[PDB]
From a paper:
Crystals for the mutant Sec4pV29 were obtained and the structure was solved at 1.9 Å resolution using the wild type [name] bound to GDP as a model for molecular replacement. The structure Sec4pV29.GDP contains two molecules in the asymmetric unit (chains A and B). Some of the crystal contacts are made through interactions with zinc atoms that are coordinated by Asp43 and Asp166 from molecule B, and His121 from molecule A. Besides the presence of the mutation [name], the P-loop region from Sec4pV29.GDP and Sec4pwt.GDP superpose almost perfectly. Furthermore, all the interactions between protein and nucleotide are conserved between the two structures. The switch I region is disordered in the molecule A and ordered in molecule B. The SWI of molecule B adopts a different conformation from that observed on the Sec4pwt.GDP structure. However, this new conformation is held in place by interactions with symmetric related molecules and is probably an artifact of crystal packing. One of the most intriguing observations made for the Sec4pwt.GDP was the interaction between the Arg81 of the SWII and the Ser29 of the P-loop. The side chain of the residue Arg81 forms a 2.8 Å length hydrogen bond with the side chain of the Ser29 residue. This interaction is not observed in the Sec4pV29.GDP structure. The structure of Sec4pV29.GDP presents a very similar fold to the wild type protein indicating that the decrease in the intrinsic nucleotide dissociation rate is not due to large conformational changes. The difference in nucleotide dissociation rate is most likely explained by changes in the protein-nucleotide environment created by the hydrophobic side chain of the Val29.
[name] is among the 11 Rab GTPases identified in [name] and acts on the surface of membranes to regulate transport between the Golgi apparatus and the plasma membrane. To complete the cycle, the protein is reactivated by switching the guanine nucleotide state from GDP to GTP in a process stimulated by guanine nucleotide exchange factors (GEFs). Therefore, the structural and functional analysis of the mutant Ser29Val of [name] offers an opportunity to understand not just the basic differences between Ras [name] families but also how [name] is activated during its [name] cycle by its GEF Sec2p. Sec2p is a highly efficient exchange factor of [name] that stimulates nucleotide exchange by binding to the switch regions of [name] and altering its conformation resulting in decreased affinity between [name] and nucleotide. In this work we have investigated the nucleotide exchange mechanism of the Rab [name] [name] and how its GEF Sec2p stimulates nucleotide dissociation, making use of the [name] mutant [name] corresponding to Gly12 in Ras proteins.
Residue numbers in the entry: 19 to 47, 54 to 184
Amino acid sequence: SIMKILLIGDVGVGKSCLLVRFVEDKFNPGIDFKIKTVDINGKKVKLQLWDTAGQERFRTITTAYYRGAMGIILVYDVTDERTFTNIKQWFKTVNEHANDEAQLLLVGNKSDMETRVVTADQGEALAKELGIPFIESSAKNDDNVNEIFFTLAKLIQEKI
Ligand SMILES: Nc1nc2c(ncn2[C@@H]2O[C@H](COP(=O)(O)OP(=O)(O)O)[C@@H](O)[C@H]2O)c(=O)[nH]1
Ligand SMILES: [Mg+2]
Ligand SMILES: [Zn+2]
């Protein structure tokens, strides 16, 4: 089966690096997606994982972008208060444009940085306000990245 999963949020928060860590298991930094197959309940699920450049940032406001998407991950940077502030607007825009059975997930990235300004309780609180699950991650330190996609994939398959 195919699960189309999108990463959404401000430029610079680590969307691409989260995607590279999940697929490649490494931190480093014209085809729009990567395919990674994962076992859920003993059955192969192929995730179709969408990441677009800030360059291409303009699509996220269109319903075309979310065509067939079943998971959407909203990402902010724990080091950047503004990217966290901006999450309510991302939520709203996603709900305006995506399938209503789409499962969403909040991710606070860069948990490795001692310059953190957004607490885990803050992220937890926002997540309840939006009615969604919440995970803190570090693409750099390899912390909680696989959990992001497995958590979301399991929620999507329970929908199905
Ligand atoms: N310390 C730290 N830096 C990160 C992490 N993830 C990404 N970065 C850096 O933040 C910048 C933005 O990452 P990127 O994946 O391009 O963000 P995008 O605009 O959301 O796709 C790059 O310089 C990354 O090296 C992380 O988990 N920890
Ligand atoms: Mg990117
Ligand atoms: Zn790893």
